[PDB]
Amino acid sequence: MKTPITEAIATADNQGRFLSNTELQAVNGRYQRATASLTAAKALTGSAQRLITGAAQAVYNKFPYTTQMPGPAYASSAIGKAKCARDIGYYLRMVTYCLVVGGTGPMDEYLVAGLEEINRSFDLSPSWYIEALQYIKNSHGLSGQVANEANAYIDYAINTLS
Amino acid sequence: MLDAFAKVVAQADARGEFLSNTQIDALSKMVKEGNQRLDIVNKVTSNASAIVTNSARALFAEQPQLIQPGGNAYTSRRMAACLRDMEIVLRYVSYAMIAGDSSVLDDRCLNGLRETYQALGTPGSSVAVAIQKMKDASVALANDTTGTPIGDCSSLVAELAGYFDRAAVSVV
Amino acid sequence: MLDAFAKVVAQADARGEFLSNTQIDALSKMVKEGNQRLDIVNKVTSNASAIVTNSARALFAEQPQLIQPGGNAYTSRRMAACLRDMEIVLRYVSYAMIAGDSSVLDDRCLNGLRETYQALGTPGSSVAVAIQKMKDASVALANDTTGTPIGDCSSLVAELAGYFDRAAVSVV
Amino acid sequence: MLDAFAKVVAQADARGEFLSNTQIDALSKMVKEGNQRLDIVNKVTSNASAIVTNSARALFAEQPQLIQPGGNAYTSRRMAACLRDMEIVLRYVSYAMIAGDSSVLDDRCLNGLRETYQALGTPGSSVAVAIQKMKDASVALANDTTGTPIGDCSSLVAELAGYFDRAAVSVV
Amino acid sequence: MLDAFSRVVVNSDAKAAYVGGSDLQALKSFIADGNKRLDAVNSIVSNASCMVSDAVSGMICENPGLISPGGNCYTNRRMAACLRDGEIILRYVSYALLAGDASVLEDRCLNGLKETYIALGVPTNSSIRAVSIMKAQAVAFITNTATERKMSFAAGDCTSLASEVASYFDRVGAAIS
Amino acid sequence: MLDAFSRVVVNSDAKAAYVGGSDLQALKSFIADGNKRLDAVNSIVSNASCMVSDAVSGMICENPGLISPGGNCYTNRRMAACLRDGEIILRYVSYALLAGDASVLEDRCLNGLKETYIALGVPTNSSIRAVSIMKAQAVAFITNTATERKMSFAAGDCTSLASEVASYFDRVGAAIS
Amino acid sequence: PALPFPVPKGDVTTTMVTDPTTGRLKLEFKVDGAAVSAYSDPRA
Amino acid sequence: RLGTVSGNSSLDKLGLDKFLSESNRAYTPRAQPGFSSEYEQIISATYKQLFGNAYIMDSERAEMAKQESMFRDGQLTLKDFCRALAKTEQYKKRFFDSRPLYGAIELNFKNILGRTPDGLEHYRAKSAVYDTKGYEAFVDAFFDDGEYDEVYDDYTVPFYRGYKTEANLSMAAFTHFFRMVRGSSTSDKANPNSMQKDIPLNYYGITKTPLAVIAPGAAGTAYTESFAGTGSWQSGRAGLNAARVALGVPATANGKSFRVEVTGYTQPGFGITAGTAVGKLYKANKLSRYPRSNKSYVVGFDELTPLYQRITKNGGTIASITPL
Numbered sequence A: 001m002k003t004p005i006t007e008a009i010a011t012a013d014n015q016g017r018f019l020s021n022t023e024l025q026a027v028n029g030r031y032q033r034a035t036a037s038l039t040a041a042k043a044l045t046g047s048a049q050r051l052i053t054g055a056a057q058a059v060y061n062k063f064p065y066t067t068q069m070p071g072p073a074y075a076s077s078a079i080g081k082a083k084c085a086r087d088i089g090y091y092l093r094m095v096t097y098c099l100v101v102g103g104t105g106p107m108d109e110y111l112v113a114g115l116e117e118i119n120r121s122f123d124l125s126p127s128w129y130i131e132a133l134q135y136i137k138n139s140h141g142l143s144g145q146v147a148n149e150a151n152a153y154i155d156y157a158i159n160t161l162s
Numbered sequence B, C, D: 001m002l003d004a005f006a007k008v009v010a011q012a013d014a015r016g017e018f019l020s021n022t023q024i025d026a027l028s029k030m031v032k033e034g035n036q037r038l039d040i041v042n043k044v045t046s047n048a049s050a051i052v053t054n055s056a057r058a059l060f061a062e063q064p065q066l067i068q069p070g071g072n073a074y075t076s077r078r079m080a081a082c083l084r085d086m087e088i089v090l091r092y093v094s095y096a097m098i099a100g101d102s103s104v105l106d107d108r109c110l111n112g113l114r115e116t117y118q119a120l121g122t123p124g125s126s127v128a129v130a131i132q133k134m135k136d137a138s139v140a141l142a143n144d145t146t147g148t149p150i151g152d153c154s155s156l157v158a159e160l161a162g163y164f165d166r167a168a169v170s171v172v
Numbered sequence E, F: 001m002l003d004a005f006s007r008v009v010v011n012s013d014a015k016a017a018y019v020g021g022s023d024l025q026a027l028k029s030f031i032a033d034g035n036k037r038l039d040a041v042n043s044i045v046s047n048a049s050c051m052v053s054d055a056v057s058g059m060i061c062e063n064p065g066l067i068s069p070g071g072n073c074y075t076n077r078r079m080a081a082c083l084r085d086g087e088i089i090l091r092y093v094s095y096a097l098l099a100g101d102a103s104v105l106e107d108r109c110l111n112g113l114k115e116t117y118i119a120l121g122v123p124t125n126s127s128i129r130a131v132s133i134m135k136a137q138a139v140a141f142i143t144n145t146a147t148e149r150k151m152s153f154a155a156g157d158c159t160s161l162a163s164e165v166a167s168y169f170d171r172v173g174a175a176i177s
Numbered sequence G: 001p002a003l004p005f006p007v008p009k010g011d012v013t014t015t016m017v018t019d020p021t022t023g024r025l026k027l028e029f030k031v032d033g034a035a036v037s038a039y040s041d042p043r044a
Numbered sequence H: 001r002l003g004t005v006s007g008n009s010s011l012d013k014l015g016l017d018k019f020l021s022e023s024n025r026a027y028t029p030r031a032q033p034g035f036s037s038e039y040e041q042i043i044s045a046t047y048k049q050l051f052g053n054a055y056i057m058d059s060e061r062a063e064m065a066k067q068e069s070m071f072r073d074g075q076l077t078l079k080d081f082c083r084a085l086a087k088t089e090q091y092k093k094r095f096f097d098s099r100p101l102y103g104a105i106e107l108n109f110k111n112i113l114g115r116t117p118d119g120l121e122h123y124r125a126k127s128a129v130y131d132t133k134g135y136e137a138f139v140d141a142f143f144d145d146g147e148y149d150e151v152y153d154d155y156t157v158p159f160y161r162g163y164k165t166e167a168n169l170s171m172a173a174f175t176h177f178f179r180m181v182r183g184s185s186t187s188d189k190a191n192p193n194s195m196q197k198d199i200p201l202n203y204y205g206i207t208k209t210p211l212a213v214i215a216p217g218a219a220g221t222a223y224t225e226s227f228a229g230t231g232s233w234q235s236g237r238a239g240l241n242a243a244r245v246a247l248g249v250p251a252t253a254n255g256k257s258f259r260v261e262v263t264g265y266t267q268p269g270f271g272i273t274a275g276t277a278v279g280k281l282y283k284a285n286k287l288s289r290y291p292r293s294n295k296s297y298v299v300g301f302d303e304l305t306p307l308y309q310r311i312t313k314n315g316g317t318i319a320s321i322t323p324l
């Protein structure tokens, strides 16, 4: 788990160093943006069921074959649609964990590592999840620097699927 | 290596739910006391050897069989290696002070350190005294009001005393 | 590693003597079935990703408690490491199909596999029920009459079952 | 490692004083054998292949188990494993004889030899006869003054044979 | 301890199903072949004194370095123990075949006899030469092709059963290995 | 349990040696002046607890801070265990003198005393400083060289056995070196 | 197994057959030496 | 002294001479009056046997000065006399209250029964009595069972029995038994694997895993590796212990694999020139080369030779070598 605090510890531990004024501004700058990032995590938490089901329908409007084609990898059934809504809820949960810790720690560990082994095995396309995340990027309805923190960790997830 | 923020995230993911509203303001409490925690480790890194040599000369005056010819920490190749262990645990508690938890502290220092002290034949009750000889000197400068505006920093130095207490238990 | 020819070398090297004539006519029976061995390993490894993903899919259907959050195979790191070990047994069983004995399967893959799983905490009764899906998806794959001419290979499909039940009793 | 001059300094530091003058002329007896140690090395380092051929000539004769089909030293690397192990029990004794103690003998060869034979199944019975077939083979080989003058060397014949029996009891 | 009848229950437990007709078809054919296995193990335990005779007097003629003074079967307690150490391990596989499961062999003896034996000092290659000398001693008796004693059975072919006691005794030898 | 009468019979059974009278002359030298061992044992076991009376008192006069805060013989409980700690090992020294081997101090005492004194933090330098004090304290009753006391002896050279207690005192600091 | 060739005084005459698989034995015309190492002479 | 076939005896040099010399049985149905050097030897035998060679002084023996006198007529030994000694403050100061519940259970088997319980179903039957029916039936759960009424008839003294094949415990209970017994110069407290503040066998007694049975008093028996489980489900770490399994392509690449057990290294010893490099003697990050000692390795048969060199040229002593 990389945080700003568990990264400046690690460069202090590389040099045998007591925590100098170099490593006391890397952890101070997390505190001047933990205000704006924890309101964005609180806002995305409350509007989760609007954003999950709205993005699951915006996938199905762009890619209509996924609701039509038979076989278990598609959203053409009841349980096929339930597992797609589970997956965007897994994706949106790791965005809010990154706004708590201030970096891409929890989606590196719990989401990204080992993801391409799944998407090739179970025949799931990575462009089904760009369209789900590009909905959430410009339909969360945030503004200012609260939107700047949520839009940083959303397109980190787009770049590890692209 | 976890943080205080990453410990409450990792408990949420193993339950599989978002963070509650009672957990965000529990962390919003933790960020507004950040400059108190930045002022604590600025006190115990600006005196990061004046703690240690004054804790060594306190212990060596108290316990005299360390410096005796034939001793455990007698010779000068077992004297800097005594001052190495007195300086890395002041380093690694100060990493655990800035993290908010101590899972950096036990895995990078204290996992089996009393088993390596068993193999060297080191008296481990006196090094636990030396952590306690370092513990009160660390809180005497954390409570020092010079140069900072005055407020209440009560439970943060009881957290800092708990990190030294966790170090001093598992070395005997 | 040892195959069937390497058995009676080491089964007579400590005995000391030469190869007796009453054993090798059973071993020249084995080369009559040498062409019915290599189609059959070609039947397994051509479908080597359709026996894995069709049986992990039928594993999480009947056991939803592994893909639920807080489960063993929950995250994407531990889903990829569940499909890794489901294919590892498919290699070392088909290695034992081409060789004539078990002794590369239970020396490189089953020697401590359940005690790997007791230390990690995976359900060792539940890896056996994924393997027994892969047993039934491969024995019923290796009885097709397309690609080969027909004829009784009923002796050689019991050996393919007999290593799939050897991994079914290794992991519990 | 430490040597025969070092232990009376190891008891001069761990006790902690200066030198007694009875500790100085005890080292005169070390150089009363000091030239007489040096030609004793010539009776064992010039006959390195000569003892380890003449001993393992004898050792399979009264004990024909090692050359049996199903015996220990059967393959030629195992028979070469005997010759790399017969000499080092004499080589580190030849390191111990120029040292005057058994510190480097215990440091680099002996500590880790009973259990290493037991994990491999090589017997503790017959690795002591490889001490004993070279024990009498160097009592005769070092007791002759061919090149050096004649006097008293009745101490050091009870020191290199004071080291083979140390290796005998440290393996059985 | 596991039974083969117990083996389908924990198979049907994490699966959370009932018992169907599908996995039931293995066990109902196990009933009618139960008497044939019951005609096997009675002759394993009744010629057991011969099987522990040829366990230890047979392995000692192919390495006699243990009766040598200094060996690992020299004294008459270790002579007595090697007669005793082999007559328990075939008593355990007589339990193991009636359940059918090797886990009763594993938890009782085969979890940790290897870690004792290098602290008890005995060699393991001598042991597996004494394990495998009971292996072909066993499989003669189940088939009735033994030379000096021929016993009463019925007529058939228990070579599926005769591989199973050979499927035990290699894992007896691999545990010490 | 070994003694010098039976040290040879675990030596000669590597040889299977029926003991003709060449090697037995050291045992006939052991029965020759074993009275000087016997006249030293009564000079030890009657003067036994005054060896340990100045052992730790001789230790604490030059190593003073073990009765200090953070010592090892601080309390009455910390000190009285140390006086039984030294009196156990000098009880086990003189078992080996009348036996004749180094058996009893290894197969009971130093089959695990190195991990004992580092489980408690017993300082190994001060727990040989007392035994080096108890080295020369234990030679003076055999020598009759003492400043304070004379034992009624007969006048010969027991210097073969006056350093044999020091040749037991060396391998008590084998593991706790 | 095959007759061993026309024996000259050669004391080793390689056993024959032997048992349930088996074979091999060095014969010195009746006596069967076979690796006891009679040349056992250390020089002390 | 070390030896397996040294004088035909395998376990007298393992540390069980006096636990196999004595039998400690009493011969009269009541203790006769008049003579006080024949039955006080039985009491100080049991004061080291039941307490595990712990120091009972006379300052606490006279605190317990009733419970031996009622044995002299009125109690039986082993069933009632050490049962009364197990209900004392001195028994509750060492084996009940400085340590957890399982550590109080798993030290009581060495004290009372002379064995080690295997798995947790033997810990299940003993700890179903404390949480329901107190401490006095918890101690008397042992004394009225088949495990106690068969091995000792009621006028012997309870010995150690966790090494024989008639004590049908397990094969793993052998391997725990020399973690618990370190010669005849230890205690519950003077034991490095657990002091009085700790628990002996937390993982290994539960999971029935066997261990390296090290002979005590050997060269470098000052070793025990610590514990951290690995994996991401249990959120553990990596780098503390070598594995107990040795599977894979490096299983049978170099032959048969082994597990070695190193006692410990220092800073003088790494160079091949017999000294210390005079300088700063460290790196910049101020750790050792082996930054914690008592480490272990997994290695095949074809690299046992340079690894045995590389331990022994560097100052490391070897506990044992077990094959995997």
Ligand SMILES: C=CC1=C(C)[C@@H](Cc2[nH]c(/C=C3N=C(/C=C4\NC(=O)[C@H](C)[C@H]4CC)C(C)=C\3CCC(=O)O)c(CCC(=O)O)c2C)NC1=O
Residues within 6 Å of the ligand: B145, B146, B147, B148, B149, B150, B151
């Ligand atoms: C009307 C009278 C009056 C005063 C004189 C102050 C007196 C005073 N100073 C400090 C405490 C302090 N006051 C300052 C502030 C400063 N120190 C400096 O070096 C600068 C010149 C200055 C502006 C940065 C600091 C930094 C401390 C804490 C450090 C210290 O005690 O030296 C405190 C404790 C908490 C507090 O700040 O209230 C008090 C009561 N208060 C009063 O009511």
Ligand SMILES: C=CC1=C(C)[C@@H](Cc2[nH]c(/C=C3N=C(/C=C4\NC(=O)[C@H](C)[C@H]4CC)C(C)=C\3CCC(=O)O)c(CCC(=O)O)c2C)NC1=O
Residues within 6 Å of the ligand: A024, A025, A028, B034, B035, B036, B037, B038, B039, B040, B042, B142, B143, B144, B145, B146, B148, B149, B150, B151, B152, B153, B156
């Ligand atoms: C980059 C490095 C860095 C630092 C070194 C500190 C320095 C620092 N501390 C404080 C601010 C403070 N510092 C303290 C702490 C203390 N006051 C005491 O008298 C106690 C001795 C001590 C408790 C541990 C408190 C209590 C405040 C807030 C003042 C107040 O209570 O009103 C402030 C004002 C703004 C802020 O709160 O951040 C600054 C810049 N902060 C940093 O960002």
Ligand SMILES: C=CC1=C(C)[C@@H](Cc2[nH]c(/C=C3N=C(/C=C4\NC(=O)[C@H](C)[C@H]4CC)C(C)=C\3CCC(=O)O)c(CCC(=O)O)c2C)NC1=O
Residues within 6 Å of the ligand: C035, C036, C037, C038, C039, C040, C041, C042, C142, C143, C144, C145, C148, C149, C150, C151, C152, C153
């Ligand atoms: C490099 C890869 C490779 C292979 C896999 C085999 C494939 C193979 N099999 C057969 C030939 C055959 N193969 C089968 C086999 C089978 N019929 C069944 O019902 C079973 C499903 C299956 C066994 C697994 C039979 C029954 C024959 C004809 C009988 C015979 O071989 O004489 C032949 C024709 C030559 C011959 O008759 O031997 C070939 C080339 N050979 C190869 O070179």
Ligand SMILES: C=CC1=C(C)[C@@H](Cc2[nH]c(/C=C3N=C(/C=C4\NC(=O)[C@H](C)[C@H]4CC)C(C)=C\3CCC(=O)O)c(CCC(=O)O)c2C)NC1=O
Residues within 6 Å of the ligand: D034, D035, D036, D038, D039, D040, D042, D043, D142, D143, D144, D145, D148, D149, D150, D151, D152, D153
């Ligand atoms: C520089 C390298 C070097 C050597 C190679 C040896 C060789 C050697 N030894 C001796 C000298 C000696 N060498 C011996 C040795 C022996 N006599 C015996 O009866 C034994 C059988 C035999 C041992 C194997 C004795 C006893 C002396 C002393 C002569 C005497 O006693 O008068 C001398 C004469 C100088 C001296 O006395 O030190 C030399 C050069 N010594 C060395 O310093």
Ligand SMILES: C=CC1=C(C)[C@@H](Cc2[nH]c(/C=C3N=C(/C=C4\NC(=O)[C@H](C)[C@H]4CC)C(C)=C\3CCC(=O)O)c(CCC(=O)O)c2C)NC1=O
Residues within 6 Å of the ligand: E047, E049, E050, E051, E053, E054, E057, E058, E059, E060, E061, E062, E132, E133, E136, E137, E140, E141, E145, E146, E147, E148, E149, E150
């Ligand atoms: C080295 C010295 C030496 C011996 C001690 C005997 C012992 C002996 N018996 C057999 C071999 C055997 N031993 C038995 C056992 C028995 N037969 C019966 O019917 C009895 C009831 C029972 C008690 C005697 C059986 C059944 C076989 C297999 C041969 C057969 O009968 O078919 C084998 C071969 C097994 C092997 O090594 O693979 C040996 C070595 N023969 C020797 O060469």
Ligand SMILES: C=CC1=C(C)[C@@H](Cc2[nH]c(/C=C3N=C(/C=C4\NC(=O)[C@H](C)[C@H]4CC)C(C)=C\3CCC(=O)O)c(CCC(=O)O)c2C)NC1=O
Residues within 6 Å of the ligand: E055, E056, E072, E073, E077, E078, E079, E081, E082, E083, E084, E085, E086, E088, E089, E108, E109, E120, E122, E123, E126, E127, E130, H009, H010, H011, H163, H164, H165, H166, H174
């Ligand atoms: C599950 C079954 C089962 C066992 C096997 C034993 C396991 C076992 N075997 C021995 C002990 C032994 N076992 C053997 C036997 C052998 N050693 C060899 O060299 C041969 C390979 C082999 C004979 C075939 C010998 C020789 C001893 C030594 C007895 C001794 O050391 O005194 C001991 C020590 C007994 C003691 O110390 O009291 C134990 C616990 N117990 C059991 O419950």
Ligand SMILES: C=CC1=C(C)[C@@H](Cc2[nH]c(/C=C3N=C(/C=C4\NC(=O)[C@H](C)[C@H]4CC)C(C)=C\3CCC(=O)O)c(CCC(=O)O)c2C)NC1=O
Residues within 6 Å of the ligand: E032, E033, E035, E036, E037, E038, E039, E040, E042, E142, E143, E144, E153, E154, E155, E156, E157, E158, E159, E161
């Ligand atoms: C009171 C004690 C008691 C027993 C001893 C067994 C006795 C027993 N054996 C078999 C019966 C049998 N047993 C065998 C077994 C064998 N035949 C062979 O050719 C091999 C040598 C050997 C093992 C492979 C076979 C082939 C049958 C006949 C098939 C069957 O009906 O089971 C049967 C069923 C038929 C019958 O009634 O005879 C019974 C009851 N059961 C008992 O209750």
Ligand SMILES: C=CC1=C(C)[C@@H](Cc2[nH]c(/C=C3N=C(/C=C4\NC(=O)[C@H](C)[C@H]4CC)C(C)=C\3CCC(=O)O)c(CCC(=O)O)c2C)NC1=O
Residues within 6 Å of the ligand: F047, F050, F051, F053, F054, F055, F057, F058, F060, F061, F062, F132, F133, F134, F136, F137, F138, F140, F141, F145, F146, F147, F148, F149
């Ligand atoms: C700092 C304080 C201090 C002490 C307490 C003493 C402790 C002490 N006692 C002895 C040495 C001894 N102690 C005894 C013991 C006794 N003599 C008897 O005859 C009695 C029966 C019995 C109790 C009085 C004996 C016999 C010796 C050896 C010779 C002697 O001093 O008499 C030695 C010498 C051991 C050595 O050489 O290492 C020392 C250091 N000395 C000190 O400097």
Ligand SMILES: C=CC1=C(C)[C@@H](Cc2[nH]c(/C=C3N=C(/C=C4\NC(=O)[C@H](C)[C@H]4CC)C(C)=C\3CCC(=O)O)c(CCC(=O)O)c2C)NC1=O
Residues within 6 Å of the ligand: F032, F033, F034, F035, F036, F038, F039, F040, F042, F142, F143, F144, F153, F154, F155, F156, F157, F158, F159
């Ligand atoms: C049950 C109790 C009991 C005993 C202990 C022995 C007592 C005993 N001690 C010695 C005898 C002796 N003791 C000594 C010893 C010494 N003289 C010195 O001045 C030295 C300081 C010291 C040497 C260490 C000597 C030299 C003899 C005479 C030689 C001999 O041992 O026979 C003798 C032989 C003298 C004789 O024949 O009368 C006897 C019987 N016997 C017993 O029945």
Ligand SMILES: C=CC1=C(C)[C@@H](Cc2[nH]c(/C=C3N=C(/C=C4\NC(=O)[C@H](C)[C@H]4CC)C(C)=C\3CCC(=O)O)c(CCC(=O)O)c2C)NC1=O
Residues within 6 Å of the ligand: F056, F066, F072, F073, F077, F078, F081, F082, F083, F085, F086, F088, F089, F108, F109, F113, F116, F120, F122, F123, F126, F127, F130, H053, H054, H055, H056, H184, H185, H186, H187, H189, H190
């Ligand atoms: C048969 C072999 C055998 C032994 C050798 C002893 C070994 C032994 N020593 C101690 C225990 C001890 N031994 C010492 C002794 C010393 N520490 C020092 O610094 C001094 C130099 C030295 C005195 C000479 C101390 C201080 C303790 C610890 C007592 C405590 O912890 O309070 C204990 C723990 C007992 C307990 O506290 O319950 C044991 C078993 N007992 C035996 O059964």
Ligand SMILES: CCC1=C(C)/C(=C/C2=NC(=C\c3[nH]c(/C=C4\NC(=O)[C@H](C)[C@H]4CC)c(C)c3CCC(=O)O)/C(CCC(=O)O)=C2C)NC1=O
Residues within 6 Å of the ligand: A059, A066, A067, A072, A073, A074, A075, A076, A079, A080, A081, A083, A084, A085, A087, A088, A090, A091, A110, A111, A118, A122, A124, A128, A129, A132, C057, C060, C067, C074, C075, C076, C079
């Ligand atoms: C937290 C990190 C994490 C990720 C990312 C993850 C993905 C994941 N998605 C899966 C399935 C699935 N995912 C989908 C999703 C979709 N298919 C569609 O048609 C839609 C377009 C799309 C939804 C946007 C479907 C239908 C399945 C079922 C595939 C099958 O049953 O074979 C499966 C197979 C197991 C199952 O859920 O049944 C995994 C492991 N698991 C994880 O633990």
Ligand SMILES: CCC1=C(C)/C(=C/C2=NC(=C\c3[nH]c(/C=C4\NC(=O)[C@H](C)[C@H]4CC)c(C)c3CCC(=O)O)/C(CCC(=O)O)=C2C)NC1=O
Residues within 6 Å of the ligand: C066, C072, C073, C077, C078, C079, C081, C082, C083, C085, C086, C088, C108, C109, C113, C116, C120, C122, C123, C126, C127, C130, H231, H232, H233, H247, H248, H249
């Ligand atoms: C050489 C051949 C080989 C074998 C035999 C092997 C076993 C093995 N399986 C492992 C983990 C694992 N194995 C599984 C698999 C499962 N758990 C479940 O609950 C399911 C029932 C099942 C999947 C269907 C899981 C979830 C892990 C944990 C991964 C981790 O913790 O990172 C690990 C720990 C390392 C890792 O893969 O992360 C090993 C060593 N590994 C090998 O490389």
Ligand SMILES: CCC1=C(C)/C(=C/C2=NC(=C\c3[nH]c(/C=C4\NC(=O)[C@H](C)[C@H]4CC)c(C)c3CCC(=O)O)/C(CCC(=O)O)=C2C)NC1=O
Residues within 6 Å of the ligand: D066, D072, D073, D078, D079, D081, D082, D083, D085, D086, D088, D108, D109, D110, D113, D116, D120, D122, D123, D126, D127, D130, H301, H304, H305, H308, H309, H312
């Ligand atoms: C650093 C110095 C050093 C020591 C102390 C050492 C011991 C040592 N001896 C070994 C093997 C061996 N040692 C022997 C020797 C014998 N077995 C017998 O039965 C005979 C009585 C005896 C003498 C002929 C044999 C046969 C092996 C191979 C074991 C096997 O392959 O089964 C091995 C295993 C690797 C190898 O084959 O070399 C080690 C590590 N190796 C070293 O490099």
Ligand SMILES: CCC1=C(C)/C(=C/C2=NC(=C\c3[nH]c(/C=C4\NC(=O)[C@H](C)[C@H]4CC)c(C)c3CCC(=O)O)/C(CCC(=O)O)=C2C)NC1=O
Residues within 6 Å of the ligand: B066, B072, B073, B077, B078, B079, B081, B082, B083, B084, B085, B086, B088, B108, B109, B110, B113, B116, B120, B122, B123, B126, B127, B130, H265, H266, H267, H286, H287, H288, H290, H291, H292, H293
């Ligand atoms: C990864 C971080 C880390 C850990 C966990 C660690 C343990 C550690 N402490 C050591 C030594 C030591 N530690 C001490 C410390 C003391 N002895 C006393 O008497 C005092 C009570 C106490 C401190 C004042 C001494 C004297 C040595 C040297 C012992 C020797 O060299 O034999 C050594 C031997 C190598 C060295 O010189 O550093 C290790 C590995 N070292 C590390 O770098």
